[PDB]
Amino acid sequence: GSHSMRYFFTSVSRPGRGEPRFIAVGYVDDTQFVRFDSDAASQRMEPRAPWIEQEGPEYWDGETRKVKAHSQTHRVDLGTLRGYYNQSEAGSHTVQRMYGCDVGSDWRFLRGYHQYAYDGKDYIALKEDLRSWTAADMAAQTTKHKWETAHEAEQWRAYLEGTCVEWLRRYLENGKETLQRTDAPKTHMTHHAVSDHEATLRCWALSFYPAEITLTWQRDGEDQTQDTELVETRPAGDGTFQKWAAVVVPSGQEQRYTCHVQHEGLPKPLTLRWE
C-alpha cells in the first residue's frame, strides 16, 4: 500500500512566565514513533514505537539536537508574529507546523508538503511543486517575499523529496512486522430497541489499522443517509482504531438493512446484516 512520514510541531507562548511550550510528534502512516515535549524531564527525542528503539545512541542524540533547535525557531516565530499582527505580550498564541512526504505502494516518491498556521489559521504553505509559497494574508505575505528572495523552498524540497523518503523507506523496513501490516476491522452489529416502533442498528468496526475506513448503510441495496449517524474514527489506545455507524429502522424491518465496510485490510468489502 501507500505510505507517509510526517511531523507535527506545536508551539504555544506562555505570557505568564517562561518560554513557549513546544511539542513535536513524528508519525509513520498512523503510527506515532517519536515525540518531544519541552516540559518533559528527558529533554530528549523519545521513542513511541518498538522498531525505532533499534536506532542507537547517535540517532537519539542527533534527533534531540535538531528538535531542540526547531523549538527555538518557533520561539522566535511567536515573537515576530505577535509584532506582524500588533498583538500585546499579554496573550497566549500558537504556531503549528506539519510537513512530510508520501510514497506509493512501490515506495517511489509521490508528494511532499509543508504547512504553517498561526492561531489555528493557515499562514504560509509550500505549493505542491515544492518550489514556491502560498500566503494566506499580508503578514504571511511579508514572510513569503523573504523566503522566496532567499530560495528557502530548495532546501525544503531537498528534505521532503530526499531525506524524508529515504528514511521513510528505512523505517518501513525496520518496522515491517507492524508498519507494512494491515489489521482488518473486526466487525459486528448490535441492536438497541429504542422504542416500541423503532430500533437502532449499530455497525461496529474495531481494532483496525490504518485508520482510513468507510462504513455505509444500505436499505434494500441502496445507500441510505437519512436517519443515519456515523461517529468520528477514534483511537483504541493500543495503536488501532475504532468506528461505528448506526441507523434507525422500523422494528421488524431489520433484515432489509445492510452495513458495508471498506478497508485496506479487506480483500473484498464486508457486508453485515441483522438476522
Binding site: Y7, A24, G26, M45, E63, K66, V67, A69, H70, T73, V76, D77, T80, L81, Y84, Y99, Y116, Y123, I124, A140, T143, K146, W147, A150, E152, Q155, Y159, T163, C164, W167
Partner: peptide, 10 residues
Amino acid sequence: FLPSDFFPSV
C-alpha cells in the same frame, strides 16, 4: 529523521 536546522524564521 528530522530535517536539519535550516528553516528560516517567519
